[PDB]
Amino acid sequence: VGRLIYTAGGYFRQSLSYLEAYNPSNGSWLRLADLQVPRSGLAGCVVGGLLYAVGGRNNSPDGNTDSSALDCYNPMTNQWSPCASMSVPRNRIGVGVIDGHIYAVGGSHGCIHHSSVERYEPERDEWHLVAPMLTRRIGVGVAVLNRLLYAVGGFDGTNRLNSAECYYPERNEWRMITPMNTIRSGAGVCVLHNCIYAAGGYDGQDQLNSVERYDVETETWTFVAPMRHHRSALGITVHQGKIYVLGGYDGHTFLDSVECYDPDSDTWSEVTRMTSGRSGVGVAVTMEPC
């Protein structure tokens, strides 16, 4: 089975429409069908083998347009198809999937910082609002573990956050969890084994290379080995037991570097580089095209 790491959108000089896929097995990259509308600050996810691009904002030379769009990419056809749009535009959004349903979390609309959250049902092609977070969060990292949704860090409109919370579906309720050891907005958040990882981000002073993980059983946050490159607004995903971080901004350039974290050895390594440096991409894993 040839599953690839897909990266959609992003930013460099302006928001981008690129859709490219990386194959860890042979190190090759493929440029696929461009997004219908350029966008950065979006989030990506996969359901039923289909790739979804959610929210973001088109920061172009002529303006800034926050997106409420949900678009679907089918590897079998290499075509994008529009889906029902969200209730509100959500730039610097966080996304997570629970039992085939897409959760859109926080994000911004102009100067508005959302605490609202909504859930998408693919087969029915409908969005519905669920309980809002206890905190307004943009640049929020989201991940799912054991059918529970976690919203980590971000910016509430006034301060960057080290706080995090969890959503319990059966009770449509959010509960704060132990806060991170570091304030992080724009971090990459994913799940590996039984922990929620938060990598990189911005603490208000510098882009970060530190990485910490939350044990959902012990409720503690522990630092692991730091990435080689400090990065914020990075893309992140997990493939075959390892974490992959893609691009981001390090306060100097838009990174094209892609690092891989091996939990067994607690080490990061440079595995490849994107075709061009960029930040604010959406990332997910699914079957190769054709």
Binding site: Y11, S40, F155, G186, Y202, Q207, A233
Partner: peptide, 9 residues
């Protein structure tokens, strides 16, 4: 420049 994203503005 947005220090978190690198984007202009």
């Amino acid at each position: 420049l947005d220090e978190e994203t690198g984007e202009f503005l």
